[PDB]
mmCIF file of C-alpha atoms in Angstrom:
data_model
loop_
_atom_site.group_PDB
_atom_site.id
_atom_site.type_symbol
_atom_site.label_atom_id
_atom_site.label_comp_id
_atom_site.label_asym_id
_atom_site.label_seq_id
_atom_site.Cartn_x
_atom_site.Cartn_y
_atom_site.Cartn_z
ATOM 1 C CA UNK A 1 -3.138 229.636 106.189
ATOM 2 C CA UNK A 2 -6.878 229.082 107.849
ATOM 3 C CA UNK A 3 -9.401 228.835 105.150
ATOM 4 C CA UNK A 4 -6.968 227.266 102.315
ATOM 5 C CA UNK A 5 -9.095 226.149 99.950
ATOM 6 C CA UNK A 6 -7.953 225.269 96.765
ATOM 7 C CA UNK A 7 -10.943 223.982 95.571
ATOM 8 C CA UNK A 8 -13.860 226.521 95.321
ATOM 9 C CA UNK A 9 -17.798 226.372 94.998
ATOM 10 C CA UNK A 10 -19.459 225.290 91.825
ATOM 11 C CA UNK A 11 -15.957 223.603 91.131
ATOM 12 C CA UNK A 12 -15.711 219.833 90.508
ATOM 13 C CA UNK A 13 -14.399 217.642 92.306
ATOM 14 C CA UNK A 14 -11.475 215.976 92.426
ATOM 15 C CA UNK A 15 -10.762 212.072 92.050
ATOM 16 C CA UNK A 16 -9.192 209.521 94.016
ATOM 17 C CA UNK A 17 -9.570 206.155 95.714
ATOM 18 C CA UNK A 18 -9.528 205.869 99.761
ATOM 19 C CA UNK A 19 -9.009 202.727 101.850
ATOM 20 C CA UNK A 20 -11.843 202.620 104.554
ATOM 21 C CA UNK A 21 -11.765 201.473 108.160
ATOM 22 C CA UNK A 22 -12.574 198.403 107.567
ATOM 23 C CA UNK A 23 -10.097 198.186 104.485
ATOM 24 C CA UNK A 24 -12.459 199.266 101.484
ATOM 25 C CA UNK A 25 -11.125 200.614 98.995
ATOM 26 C CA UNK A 26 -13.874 203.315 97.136
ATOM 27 C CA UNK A 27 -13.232 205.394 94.561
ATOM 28 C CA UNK A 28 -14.810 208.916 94.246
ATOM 29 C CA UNK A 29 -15.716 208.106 90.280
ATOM 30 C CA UNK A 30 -18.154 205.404 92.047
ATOM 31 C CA UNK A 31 -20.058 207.607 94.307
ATOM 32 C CA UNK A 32 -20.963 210.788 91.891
ATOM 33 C CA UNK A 33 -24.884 211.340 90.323
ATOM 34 C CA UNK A 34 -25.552 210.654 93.794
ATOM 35 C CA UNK A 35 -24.731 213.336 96.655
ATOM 36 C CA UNK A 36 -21.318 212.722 98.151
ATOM 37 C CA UNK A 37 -20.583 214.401 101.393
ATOM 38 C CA UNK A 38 -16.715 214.629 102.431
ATOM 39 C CA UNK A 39 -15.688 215.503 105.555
ATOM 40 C CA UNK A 40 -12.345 216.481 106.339
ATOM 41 C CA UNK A 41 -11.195 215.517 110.111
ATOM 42 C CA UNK A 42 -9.195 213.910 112.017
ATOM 43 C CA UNK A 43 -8.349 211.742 115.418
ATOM 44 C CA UNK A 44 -6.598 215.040 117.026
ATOM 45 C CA UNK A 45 -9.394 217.812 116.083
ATOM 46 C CA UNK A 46 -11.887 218.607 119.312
ATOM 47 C CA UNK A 47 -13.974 220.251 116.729
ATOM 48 C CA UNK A 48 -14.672 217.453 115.272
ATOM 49 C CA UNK A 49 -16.303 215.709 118.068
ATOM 50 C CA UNK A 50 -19.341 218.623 117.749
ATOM 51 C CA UNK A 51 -19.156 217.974 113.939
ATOM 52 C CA UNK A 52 -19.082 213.977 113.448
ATOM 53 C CA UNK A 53 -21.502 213.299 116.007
ATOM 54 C CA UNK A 54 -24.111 216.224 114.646
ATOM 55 C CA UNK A 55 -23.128 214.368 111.004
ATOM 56 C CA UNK A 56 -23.698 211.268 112.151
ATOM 57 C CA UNK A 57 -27.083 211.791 113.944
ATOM 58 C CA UNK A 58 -28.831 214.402 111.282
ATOM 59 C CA UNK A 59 -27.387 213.361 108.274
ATOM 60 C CA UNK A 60 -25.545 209.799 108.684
ATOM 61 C CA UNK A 61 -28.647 208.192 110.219
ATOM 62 C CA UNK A 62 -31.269 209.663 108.074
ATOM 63 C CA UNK A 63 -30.202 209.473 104.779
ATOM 64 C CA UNK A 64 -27.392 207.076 104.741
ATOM 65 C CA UNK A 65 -28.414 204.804 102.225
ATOM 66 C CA UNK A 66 -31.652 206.194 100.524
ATOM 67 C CA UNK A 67 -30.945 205.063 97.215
ATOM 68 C CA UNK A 68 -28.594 208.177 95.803
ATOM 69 C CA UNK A 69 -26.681 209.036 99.353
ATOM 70 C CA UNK A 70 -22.734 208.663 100.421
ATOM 71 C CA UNK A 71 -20.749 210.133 103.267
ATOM 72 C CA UNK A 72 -17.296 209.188 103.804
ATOM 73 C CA UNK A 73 -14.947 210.721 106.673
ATOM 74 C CA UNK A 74 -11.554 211.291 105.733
ATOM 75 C CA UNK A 75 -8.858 211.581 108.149
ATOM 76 C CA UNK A 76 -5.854 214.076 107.461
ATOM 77 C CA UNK A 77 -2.755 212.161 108.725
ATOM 78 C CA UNK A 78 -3.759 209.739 111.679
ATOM 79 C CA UNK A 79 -3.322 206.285 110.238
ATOM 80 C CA UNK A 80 -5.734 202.779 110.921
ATOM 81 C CA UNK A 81 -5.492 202.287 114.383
ATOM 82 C CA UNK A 82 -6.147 205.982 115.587
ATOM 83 C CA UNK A 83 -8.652 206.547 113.429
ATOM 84 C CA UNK A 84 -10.250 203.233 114.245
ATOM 85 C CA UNK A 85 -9.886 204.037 117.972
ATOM 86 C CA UNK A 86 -11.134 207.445 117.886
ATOM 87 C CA UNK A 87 -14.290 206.918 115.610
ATOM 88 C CA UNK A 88 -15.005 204.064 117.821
ATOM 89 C CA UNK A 89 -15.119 206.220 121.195
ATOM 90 C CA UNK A 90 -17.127 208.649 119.148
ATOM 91 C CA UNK A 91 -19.571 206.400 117.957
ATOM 92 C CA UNK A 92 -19.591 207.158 113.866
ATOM 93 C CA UNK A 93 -21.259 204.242 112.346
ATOM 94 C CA UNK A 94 -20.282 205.744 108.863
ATOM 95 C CA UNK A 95 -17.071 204.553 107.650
ATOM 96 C CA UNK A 96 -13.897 206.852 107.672
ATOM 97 C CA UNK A 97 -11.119 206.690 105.364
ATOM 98 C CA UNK A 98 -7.378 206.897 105.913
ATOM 99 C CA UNK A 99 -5.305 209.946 104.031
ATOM 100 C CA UNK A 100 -1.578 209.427 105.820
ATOM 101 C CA UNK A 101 0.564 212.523 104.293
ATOM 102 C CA UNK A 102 -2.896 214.619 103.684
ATOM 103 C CA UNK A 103 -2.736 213.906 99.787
ATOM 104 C CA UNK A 104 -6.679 213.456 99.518
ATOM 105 C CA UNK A 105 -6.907 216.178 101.720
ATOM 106 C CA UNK A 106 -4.594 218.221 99.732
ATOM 107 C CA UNK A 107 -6.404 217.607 96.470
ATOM 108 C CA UNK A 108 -9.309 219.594 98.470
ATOM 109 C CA UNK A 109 -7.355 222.271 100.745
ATOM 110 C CA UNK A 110 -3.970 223.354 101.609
ATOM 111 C CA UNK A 111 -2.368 220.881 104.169
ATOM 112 C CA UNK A 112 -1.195 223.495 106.202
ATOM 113 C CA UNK A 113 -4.233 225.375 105.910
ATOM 114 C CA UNK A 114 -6.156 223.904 108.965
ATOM 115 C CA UNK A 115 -8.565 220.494 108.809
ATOM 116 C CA UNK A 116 -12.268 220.846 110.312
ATOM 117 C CA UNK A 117 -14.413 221.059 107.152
ATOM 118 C CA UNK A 118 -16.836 219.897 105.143
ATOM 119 C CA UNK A 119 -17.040 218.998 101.162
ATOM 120 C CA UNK A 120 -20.355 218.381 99.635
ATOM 121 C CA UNK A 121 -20.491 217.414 96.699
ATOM 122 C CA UNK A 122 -23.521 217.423 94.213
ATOM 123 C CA UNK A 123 -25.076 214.977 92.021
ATOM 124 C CA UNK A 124 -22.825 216.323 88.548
ATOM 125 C CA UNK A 125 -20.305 216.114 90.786
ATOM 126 C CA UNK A 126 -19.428 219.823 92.049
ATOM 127 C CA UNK A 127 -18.940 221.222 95.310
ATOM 128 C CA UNK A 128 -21.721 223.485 96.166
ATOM 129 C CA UNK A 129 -21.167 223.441 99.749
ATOM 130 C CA UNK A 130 -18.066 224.599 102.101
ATOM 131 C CA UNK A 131 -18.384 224.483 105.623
ATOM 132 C CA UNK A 132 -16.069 225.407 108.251
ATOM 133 C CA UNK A 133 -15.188 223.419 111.245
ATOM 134 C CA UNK A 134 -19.098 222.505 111.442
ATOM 135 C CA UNK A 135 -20.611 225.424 112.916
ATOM 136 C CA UNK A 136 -24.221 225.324 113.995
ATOM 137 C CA UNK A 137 -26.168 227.587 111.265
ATOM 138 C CA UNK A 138 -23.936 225.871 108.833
ATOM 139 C CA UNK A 139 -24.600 222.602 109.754
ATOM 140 C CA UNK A 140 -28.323 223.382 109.652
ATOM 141 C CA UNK A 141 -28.518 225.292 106.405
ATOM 142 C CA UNK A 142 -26.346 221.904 105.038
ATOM 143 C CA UNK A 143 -28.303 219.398 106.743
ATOM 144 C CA UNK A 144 -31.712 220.916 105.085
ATOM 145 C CA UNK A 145 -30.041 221.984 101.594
ATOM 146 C CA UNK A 146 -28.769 218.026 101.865
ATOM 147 C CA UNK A 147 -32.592 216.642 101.993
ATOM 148 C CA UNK A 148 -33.209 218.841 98.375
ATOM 149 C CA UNK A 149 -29.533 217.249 97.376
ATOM 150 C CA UNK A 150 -31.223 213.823 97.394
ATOM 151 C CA UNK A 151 -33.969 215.162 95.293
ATOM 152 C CA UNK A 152 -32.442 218.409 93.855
ATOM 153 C CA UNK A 153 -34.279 221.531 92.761
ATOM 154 C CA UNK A 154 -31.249 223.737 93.137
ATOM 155 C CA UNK A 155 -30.543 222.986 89.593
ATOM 156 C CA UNK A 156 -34.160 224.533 88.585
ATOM 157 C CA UNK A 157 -33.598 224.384 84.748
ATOM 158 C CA UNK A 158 -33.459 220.559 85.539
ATOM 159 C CA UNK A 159 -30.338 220.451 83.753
#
């Protein structure tokens, strides 16, 4: 379908353990308490190429260490060399992962239900936001809600 999530908002999110462009292998266990933002793309998505670079240069560049950040790309079915060859001609300095068959992307979304979006993922480990295909507002609402994420306030009660 277009919007086949399987995954929903306050849900939490799933494990698993992606090899990296430069042949890293990182689990998702490893990166939660800190604020894990998955993006879900790939070599043959235009889209994309508004929504990595905007990642990249808002969120990527700002807060990509800090202390408490991670963003990882994941690409839906294009293997090493395509995704290598792509990110490279798109700059992305943050490193992309390899998901040939769409089985880390189907432990998010429906394989057949589209690509271009975006999983953040909180400090306890739940999704709080979806985005689709980028999308200006949505990028900006994410980009600022991400600069609380690395503090977070959203929780209020503290816990």
């Amino acid at each position: 379908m277009s919007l086949g999530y399987i995954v929903r908002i306050g849900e939490m999110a799933p494990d698993f353990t992606i090899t990296l462009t430069d042949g890293k292998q990182v689990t998702l266990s490893s990166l939660r308490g800190k604020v894990v933002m998955l993006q879900f793309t790939a070599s043959w998505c235009g889209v994309c190429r508004k929504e990595m670079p905007f990642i990249e240069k808002d969120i990527w560049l700002k807060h990509k260490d800090n202390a408490d950040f991670a963003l990882i790309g994941i690409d839906r079915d294009e293997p090493l060399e395509k995704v290598l060859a792509f990110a490279k001609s798109t700059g992305v300095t943050y490193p992309l992962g390899l998901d040939p068959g769409a089985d880390i992307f189907a432990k998010y979304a429906l394989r057949d239900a589209g690509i271009t979006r975006n999983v953040l993922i909180d400090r306890e480990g739940k999704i709080v936001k979806l985005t689709r295909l980028y999308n200006e507002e949505e990028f900006a609402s994410l980009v600022q809600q991400i600069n609380e994420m690395l503090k977070e306030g959203h929780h209020h009660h503290h816990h």
